[PDB]
């Protein structure tokens, strides 16, 4: 009885932008390389694109598959275009908040694409990890899947920490009116906010649950954005960060090996003092996340 | 995108055309907080 696996990747306006088709081979490569399915299980790549981004990940794939360890693999693409489409209802009283800078642009919304991908995908896509493109796997993408079970009850996504400090400046405001808040605050006891490289988007348990349906009305959204005097630029992000402050019971907390973030840019913008307690990250590295266009290692 | 803004007030990006003043993170100065 075939079991499918669904990993899906934004990969837009890839066209004449070498560094963006250099990190996807990055990705891509180890991706494949280290992982490992069992015979009956399929692997199903999902990308967002545009026309001529589907033609250069093809190409692209062509090079990388079929997989040196023999498993199924499936490639689907979805259009850009399509889905900034279904997510503009949902999604549009949220971008005001989240998206670079103001109002409302259709260009912005296919940012927000993990917060109503229950909504988006087929119901027959119980589960779909989202990943980064600008990642490099260090271990077999099989595994991640078993996280899933740990979810306890009421939680919809999973999700690494954020490993700057960049939430202990956007919630200044409310950490100044606040002082005794965990909100912005690094781990192990504060509430540093999320990072979207690598999310583990349950769609049934989205679709089913009460909560999360809730916070995405515009009245809700509004009202936790005033609450936490928030805005930010970073999409979906910014709305997973802000809500989990308010309900963390929805969100599955990933060990900070499974979306190991390089940027360091928030260090050397007012935070060298406390930017280590937020960046510490130790254990066996899963994914390396080169954000801002920072250098992998090797 | 936009570059974040490096003031503590105001909008994500810097130079939010909404904003005048710029109170910066401790340690730093300047219009956007270079110095
Ligand atoms: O032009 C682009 C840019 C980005 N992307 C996709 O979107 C992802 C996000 O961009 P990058 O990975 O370069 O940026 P970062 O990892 O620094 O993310 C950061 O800035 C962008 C925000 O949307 C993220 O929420 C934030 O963490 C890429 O990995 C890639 O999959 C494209 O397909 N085309
Ligand atoms: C502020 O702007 C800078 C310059 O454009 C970005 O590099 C910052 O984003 C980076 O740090 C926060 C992480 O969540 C992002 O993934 C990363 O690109 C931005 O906060
Ligand atoms: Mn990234």
């Known amino acids: ?44 790549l999902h990308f967002v694109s545009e026309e001529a981004s589907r033609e250069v990940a093809k190409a692209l794939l062509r090079e990388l ?3 040196a360890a023999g498993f199924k693999c499936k490639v689907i693409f979805h259009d850009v275009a399509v889905l900034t489409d279904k997510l503009f209802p949902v999604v549009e009283a949220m ?48 595994e991640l899947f078993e996280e899933f079970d740990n979810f306890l009850p009421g939680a919809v996504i999973g999700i690494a ?14 950490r100044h009116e606040n002082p005794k808040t965990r909100v912005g605050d690094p781990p192990p006891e504060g509430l540093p906010g999320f990072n979207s490289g690598v999310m583990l988007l349950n769609l049934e348990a989205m679709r089913q649950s009460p909560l999360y349906s809730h916070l995405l009305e515009p009245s809700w959204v509004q009202q936790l954005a005033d609450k936490y005097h928030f805005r930010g630029h970073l ?18 907390v990933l060990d900070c090996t499974w979306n190991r ?18 960046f510490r990250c130790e254990g066996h590295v899963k994914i390396y996340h080169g954000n801002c266009n920072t250098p992998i290692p090797e | 995108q936009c570059e974040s803004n490096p003031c503590l007030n105001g909008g994500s990006c810097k130079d939010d055309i909404n904003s005048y003043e710029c109170w910066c993170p401790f340690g730093f100065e300047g219009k956007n907080c270079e110095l």
Request: charged share 20%; net charge neutral.
């Open chain 1, 161 to 174: 920490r954020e490993m700057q400090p960049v939430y202990r400046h956007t919630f200044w405001q409310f």
């Open chain 1, 1 to 44: 009885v075939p079991v499918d696996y669904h990993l899906l990747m934004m990969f837009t306006k890839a066209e004449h932008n070498a560094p963006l088709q250099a990190k996807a081979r990055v990705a891509l490569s180890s991706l494949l390389r280290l992982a490992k399915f069992e015979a009956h299980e399929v692997l199903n």
């Open chain 1, 65 to 67: 598959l079929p997989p």
């Open chain 1, 95 to 142: 971008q005001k908040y989240f998206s670079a800078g103001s109002g409302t642009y259709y260009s912005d919304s296919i940012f927000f694409l993990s917060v109503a991908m229950h909504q988006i995908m087929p119901k027959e896509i119980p589960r779909i990890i989202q990943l980064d493109l600008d990642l490099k796997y260090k271990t077999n993408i099989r």
């Open chain 1, 261 to 278: 973030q390089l940027c360091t840019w928030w260090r050397d913008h007012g935070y060298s003092d406390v930017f280590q307690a937020y």
């Open chain 1, 235 to 252: 999409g979906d992000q910014d709305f997973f960060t802000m809500i989990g402050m308010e309900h963390p019971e929805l969100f599955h």
